[model samples]
Target: QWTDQSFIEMMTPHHQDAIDMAEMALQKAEHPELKKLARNIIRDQEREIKEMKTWYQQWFKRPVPAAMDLDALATAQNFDREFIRQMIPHHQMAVMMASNLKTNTERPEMDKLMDDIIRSQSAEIKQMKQWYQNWYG
Candidate 1:
């Protein structure tokens, strides 16, 4: 249970993690589908961040945190099993957040988006887990 301010502050870093992963995928992914997925992620998440900022301003009446520094966030990142390892937590948090929303939120749009995220990211997490094990071990 968080106050509106608390939730917005907490969500900033969580959102950054997703942006960081998307940037890494954009830079290093070989598969076209993955690259496109990354681009889509960046696009969608940016919009979501904007929406979140509006909520932040409406309730807390503050400007959003400075534009999240995705490039700095990904410094020294390498495209490998290690990257996948990093991403697993990111996706896992998203799935967790989605599950929480499903439990608590009544809005249809938010509920649907959360359900899609839980399903898609759970599948992607499993795929990444396999990719990591197959390549890293």
Candidate 2:
């Protein structure tokens, strides 16, 4: 059944990976601005994770899906740059998925969530690209 439930299930892991990556970045490096961004990512994404879990439990009358893990690529050599580079594409993919949900979701709340995802992630992608260029240019 391709509903908001399915979308939430699919995106839950994706969001978790971003959270994992951000957490890794915070530990591997100490750039003040990057640390601040990572903190925001963890805080905001964790809140959304809770919201999705609660919604799925209420709507589907089942246990929420298990948390998924992704290997963090935060090597000593490429800690900060790797995080920024990896996150740009990750956020880009999220924006793409949100775009797909534009026609897929039935509820107004889901539509609003999709809109916010697209807006926020697109801006973050642009900002990350600029940072990548500045740091790795």
Candidate 3:
């Protein structure tokens, strides 16, 4: 349902959704650890969106698109299938971009960052695929 380019395009919105979800749980999330984790996700992904945009300019030589509503992806009133479908390619592109970083980046920080992205995004891809199957199957 998403192309590689669309995958990259979708990431910012997908991440924003995660941040929004996490923020919504900020007050009522049962566990302190989970709350902290959600906050961290918001922080990390927000920064990552910035990083991705920078890379979009430098690496892809293009501008990241403006934000748009994704309410159609909600599992309920505010969501749609677009949420899950969006995340698959978002994780895919993160993994693919990490691979590209592995080959081109020589700094220790860059290498470690790429490694972490590859590891995390690979697992996330699997999880998102499951959501896709469970939801759409």
Candidate 4:
């Protein structure tokens, strides 16, 4: 009963990471494929972020407190490579967080969003890994 609030808070960071990378991606125009992906990723992530932020305030009476390392890219060669490297791990954390937050959400919107995060971000990791090995390796 009480833990659901924590679950909502947990998503606060997970989705924040997604939007952060995506916002960076949106600005950098890093790669052909990555460039395209950012639009939808930001749409989904920020929408969720707003929805949860509202609930975090509405239900618990404050804005969602953020966490995690804010990504800062190094220009090793190209940011495309760095994006894949960093985003995959970020994706993993979000997926893992969603897994842990599972069933802890009572709100149907949070519940549906949890499943989408787990599956979508989990798949995103695999796609990024393949891009890493194909282009960078």
**lDDT of every model, 2 decimals:** 0.65, 0.77, 0.60, 0.72
Residues 1-137 of candidate 1 have per-residue lDDT tens digits of: 44345544665667667777778777777556556767766776676666668766876677866533345445634454445656678778778766775677655655665666688678878877876666656
Q: Write the per-residue lDDT of candidate 3 for residues 87-133, one digit (tens) a residue.
A: 45656766776687577654554567567768866775676576557
Each prediction's RMSD over C-alphas, in Å, is 4.1, 2.5, 6.8, 2.7
TM-score of each: 0.66, 0.87, 0.53, 0.81
Give candidate 3's error at residue 69 in angstroms.
5.4
Candidate 2 lDDT score at position 109: 70
Q: Among all windows of ten consecutive residues in candidate 3, which has the lowest summed lDDT? A: 72-81
| TM-score for candidate 3, residues paired by index | 0.53
Task: Give the candidates in order of TM-score, highest first.
Answer: 2, 4, 1, 3
* Better candidate by TM-score, 1 or 4: 4
Best-fitting candidate, measured by TM-score?
Answer: 2
User: Could you give candidate 2's per-residue lDDT for residues 5-110 as a string of tens digits?
Assistant: 8778887888888898888777875566678778878887787777778888888899677622235464447677777767888888888888888788788877
Candidate 4 TM-score versus the reference: 0.81
